[PDB]
Amino acid sequence: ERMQILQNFKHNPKINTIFISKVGDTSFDLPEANVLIQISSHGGSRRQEAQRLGRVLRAKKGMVAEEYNAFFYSLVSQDTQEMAYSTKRQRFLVDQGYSFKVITKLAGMEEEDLAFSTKEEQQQLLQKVLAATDLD
Amino acid sequence: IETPEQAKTRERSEKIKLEFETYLRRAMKRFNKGVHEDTHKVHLLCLLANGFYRNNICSQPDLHAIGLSIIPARFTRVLPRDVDTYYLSNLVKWFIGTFTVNAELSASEQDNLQTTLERRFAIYSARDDEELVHIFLLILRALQLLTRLVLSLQWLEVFCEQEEKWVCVDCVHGVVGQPLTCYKYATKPMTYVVGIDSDGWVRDVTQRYDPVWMTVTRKCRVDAEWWAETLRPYQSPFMDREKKEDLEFQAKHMDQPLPTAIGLYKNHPLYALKRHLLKYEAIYPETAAILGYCRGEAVYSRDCVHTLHSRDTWLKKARVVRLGEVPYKMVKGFSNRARKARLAEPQLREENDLGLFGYWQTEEYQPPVAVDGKVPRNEFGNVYLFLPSMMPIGCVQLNLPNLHRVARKLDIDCVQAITGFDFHGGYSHPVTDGYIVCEEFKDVLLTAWENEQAVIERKEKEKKEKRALGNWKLLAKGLLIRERLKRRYGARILAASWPQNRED
Amino acid sequence: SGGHPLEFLRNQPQFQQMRQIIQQNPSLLPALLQQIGRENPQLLQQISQHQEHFIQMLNEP
């Protein structure tokens, strides 16, 4: 099933979004992509996620002239301990000269319709998360 | 031109449907042909039962007394041991002139066969050939002659002690001792011929009368095993008589016809001709003397022709080839990628050599002996257990599920017992039955295995309850959690919470 | 005693007719064939073994 999903991601144009757990670091081969979004952190793996990012994104023809041909986004929760984890982790990449721009406002979210538009939906998500106890 | 994967899937589905339909058709054909063959066998059994009934009716004492009264005094004074061909011929000639053929007489189905025969005796007329044969059989049994009624699915067989032979008698044409004439004037095409004695015993006498017995009839008859089982209850107690009949048949059929047709030579132990031999058969020795020529094809001795098994299957059959034996015959093999390499390279199609060793080259497989609590293993780490004798000395095979885990917990050697191979899925998957363990450590291990089972018997329901407990806990928390939010609750905020009240 | 599956067929009216036909007059042989051509797996299976009881039943008057 993993290989079938990988082949669908590589070949099927309808599916271009794959969710990968921690196994995406070295347990298998990462297909060439252009957008990598990191939501969850190990807790300060400054080298593991850097290696994962290096492995995920490869050179793409067509956008060689542009200085921004591969896109990486790190979703970090404000005022949380995830801020410290991200700051500690990105130190290795900053030592390599990689820049990191902080984006607090996303342009286009107001026009586009997204899930949890109403606050009661967010209350339902909170109920679901609280239902997931410390066991998960 | 559009979704080639979909087209391939459609073609594969059509192929699978066609294969399944062909399988259903061939299964239906197999069932129908089996039903037809069983129906033919049942019809043959019905004819045999009718012959039994006719023979039983012919054994009545009243009919014998009537026949003896009818028989003239010149025939009643001859002992059965003094009966020869001339006496039988004279008796047949008298019988023909005594009873005539008259089918115009009334034939009522209500009249029993014994009553019908008594009426025929009273009128001295025969409705048909069957009644004439029955009357002649009654006449023969009147003199207490050892006579058998012979039917082709009819005539009589008389046992003469002067030559100790069964002489055929046909009263229809006045024929005595001419099996060829009886074969010519017999019933519908001859496949089985059975002779029933007055005592009820049945003997196969098709060989004596059929000249095509050894070539066409032999391949067109019923199963030998089923027929032998059917005739086993009615085997004649005269074992010496049966042996004499078999010897006479063998003497008659020992290379008497000498056919020259190629097709008759194919698949025949009597002849053992040329290339028509099977793929797994060879000639041992290769210097077999030529027994004849058939259109340029040499005849060899069947005793010199043997079926040869492979060394692997020799081991499977608990036999070991002698060391250094040259493979007598080289054949092809059907196996995994090792065989499939012939498909890639055609030049290796005939290069694949499999040595089929003969029985003379294989002596016996001697199972090893377990030493120092160690189970012997093959080249692949297992033990071949196709036969019980193949089990190594000091080893016991145990059919205990999850026994290997217990053995490893106790650090006890555990070897799989290979018993067969499954050819499903296009590959010969091995089949194992139980584990081979040392006998000295057997019983204690069994107890531990039982203890392990007891562990499961102790450690199953508990864990189930544990799951339920967690569920209950979860359920409780759920309510509390919802209730908690009720205690709390029973885009402007998000878009502009922290980084807007100062930027804007 | 020799309990056979043919015991039910021993007193079965259709099988009684069959044994009566097989007894003396084989004229009605094909009709029984048609019966065995319809559906009789039990008769096919059980007729191969213990023919003594089968023959004795066929010879019952």
- Closest residue by Cα to residue B301 from B313, B309, B289: B289
B-C contacts (CB, under 8 Å)? 51
- Work out the angle at residue B218's Cα, subtended by the Cα atoms of residues B213 and B222, and round it to the nearest 5 degrees: 125
Q: Which residue has the tokens 């205690």?
A: B487
Q: Chains B, A in contact: 3+ Cβ pairs under 8 A?
A: yes
Q: A78 vs B498: CB contact, 8 Å cut-off?
A: yes
Instruction: Go through B294-327 and write b for each residue having 16 or more CB atoms within 10 A of its CB, e for each that does not.
Output: beeeebbebebbbebbbbeebbbebbebeeeeeb
Say how far apart CA B131 and CA B105 lie, in whole Å: 12
Q: How was this structure determined?
A: cryo-EM
**Residue B415 CB: number of other CB atoms within 10 A?**
24
Q: Check: CB of residue B167 under 8 Å from CB of residue B177.
A: yes
Phi-psi region of B424 (alpha: psi -120 to 50; beta: other; left: phi over 0): beta
Exposure of B439 in the CB half-sphere (CA atoms within 13 A) = 9
Q: Chains C, B in contact: 3+ Cβ pairs under 8 A?
A: yes
Beta pairing, strands B165-170 & B155-160: antiparallel
- For residue B21, CA distances in Å to B16, B28, B30, B425 come to 9, 11, 14, 20
List C40's β-bridge partners, or say none.
none
Nearest residue on chain B to A105, alpha-carbon basis: B495
- For residue B202, CA distances in Å to A29, B223, B312, B348 come to 80, 17, 46, 58
Burial of residue A112 (number of CB atoms within 10 Å: 0-12, 13-18, 19+)? exposed
Burial of residue B457 (number of CB atoms within 10 Å: 0-12, 13-18, 19+)? exposed
- Closest residue by Cα to residue C45 from B219, B234, B231, B41: B41
- Work out the angle at residue A20's Cα, subtended by the Cα atoms of residues A17 and A24, and round it to the nearest 5 degrees: 125
Say how far apart CA B174 and CA B151 lie, in whole Å: 17
- When CB atoms are compared, the residue of B43, B53, B230 closest to C51 is B230
Length, in residues, of chain A: 136
- Share of chain B residues as helix, strand and coil, in percent rounded to the nearest 5: 50, 15, 35
Say how far apart CA B66 and CA B43 lie, in whole Å: 34
- Provide the 8-state DSSP code for B338: H
- When CB atoms are compared, the residue of A110, A119, A133 closest to B477 is A133
Beta pairing, strands B202-204 & B155-160: unpaired
Q: Which residue has the tokens 């054949």?
A: B331
Which of A4, A105, A121 is the best mutation test for B, with the most CBs of B within 10 A?
A105
Which of A101, A127, A128, A134 is the best mutation test for B, with the most CBs of B within 10 A?
A127
Those residues with Cβ within 8 angstroms of residue A107's Cβ, 6 or more apart along the chain or in another chain: none
Say how far apart CA C61 and CA C49 lie, in whole Å: 23
Q: Find out whether A47 is annotated in a ligand binding site.
A: no
**Residue B123 CB: number of other CB atoms within 10 A?**
13
List B281's β-bridge partners, or say none.
B307
Q: Is the peptide bond before C13 cis (omega within 30 degrees of 0)?
A: no
Backbone φ, ψ for residue B38 (5° rounding): -65, -35
Q: Check: CB of residue B201 under 8 Å from CB of residue B146.
A: no
- Closest residue by Cα to residue B125 from B98, B99, B91, B92: B99
- When CB atoms are compared, the residue of A78, A105, A123 closest to B489 is A123
Say how far apart CA B382 and CA B376 lie, in whole Å: 8
Phi-psi region of A66 (alpha: psi -120 to 50; beta: other; left: phi over 0): beta
Which tokens go with C35?
A: 């019966």
Which tokens go with B345?
A: 């390279």
Length, in residues, of chain B: 504
Q: Where are the beta strands (DSSP E) in B2-124?
A: 100-101
Those residues with Cβ within 8 angstroms of residue B394's Cβ, 6 or more apart along the chain or in another chain: B369, B370, B438, B439, B440
Say how far apart CA B7 and CA A122 lie, in whole Å: 46
Query: Residue type at B346?
Result: P
Backbone φ, ψ for residue B365 (5° rounding): -90, 125
Q: Where are the beta strands (DSSP E) in B135-283?
A: 147-152, 155-160, 165-170, 175-176, 193-197, 202-204, 281-283
Q: Chains C, A in contact: 3+ Cβ pairs under 8 A?
A: no
Beta pairing, strands B193-197 & B202-204: antiparallel
Q: B229 vs C48: CB contact, 8 Å cut-off?
A: yes
Q: Check: CB of residue B153 under 8 Å from CB of residue B193.
A: yes
DSSP assignment of B404-470 equals: HHHHHHTT---EEEEEEEE-GGGS-EEEEEEEEEESTTHHHHHHHHHHHHHHHHHTTHHHHHHHHHH
Task: Say yes or no: B50 contacts chain C, CB-CB below 8 A.
Answer: yes
**Residue B147 CB: number of other CB atoms within 10 A?**
24
Task: Say yes or no: B493 contacts chain A, CB-CB below 8 A.
Answer: yes
Q: Find out whether A55 is annotated in a ligand binding site.
A: yes
Say how far apart CA B39 and CA B47 lie, in whole Å: 12
Q: Please report the resolution in angstroms.
A: 7.1
- Work out the angle at residue B58's Cα, subtended by the Cα atoms of residues B206 and B199, and round it to the nearest 5 degrees: 65
Say how far apart CA C26 and CA B395 lie, in whole Å: 62
Nearest residue on chain B to A109, alpha-carbon basis: B495
Which of B480, B494, B501 is the best mutation test for A, with the most CBs of A within 10 A?
B494
Q: What is the CA radius of gyration of chain C?
A: 11
Beta pairing, strands B354-357 & B297-298: unpaired
Q: Is B352 helix (H, G, I), strand (E, B) or coil?
A: coil
Q: Check: CB of residue B38 under 8 Å from CB of residue B30.
A: no
Say how far apart CA B48 and CA B442 lie, in whole Å: 58
Say how far apart CA B125 and CA B123 lie, in whole Å: 5
What is the SS3 string spanning B97-143?
Answer: HHCEECCCCCCCCCCCHHHHHHHHHHHCEECCHHHHHHHHHHHHHHC
- When CB atoms are compared, the residue of A104, A110, A117 closest to B499 is A104
The dihedral through the CA atoms of B460, B464, B465, B470 has a sign that is positive
Say how far apart CA B330 and CA B350 lie, in whole Å: 10
Residue range(s) defining the domain that contains residue C28: 1-61
Task: Say yes or no: B288 contacts chain C, CB-CB below 8 A.
Answer: no
Q: Which residue has the tokens 């059994």?
A: B45
Q: How many domains does chain C have?
A: 1
Q: How far is CA B459 from the centre of its chain?
A: 50
Q: Check: CB of residue B492 under 8 Å from CB of residue B501.
A: no
- Closest residue by Cα to residue B54 from B227, B202, B236: B202
Q: Check: CB of residue B172 under 8 Å from CB of residue B184.
A: no
- Provide the 8-state DSSP code for A54: H
- Closest residue by Cα to residue C26 from B114, B46, B39, B130: B46
Q: Is B390 helix (H, G, I), strand (E, B) or coil?
A: helix
Q: Check: CB of residue B174 under 8 Å from CB of residue B92.
A: yes
Exposure of B8 in the CB half-sphere (CA atoms within 13 A) = 3
Those residues with Cβ within 8 angstroms of residue B461's Cβ, 6 or more apart along the chain or in another chain: none
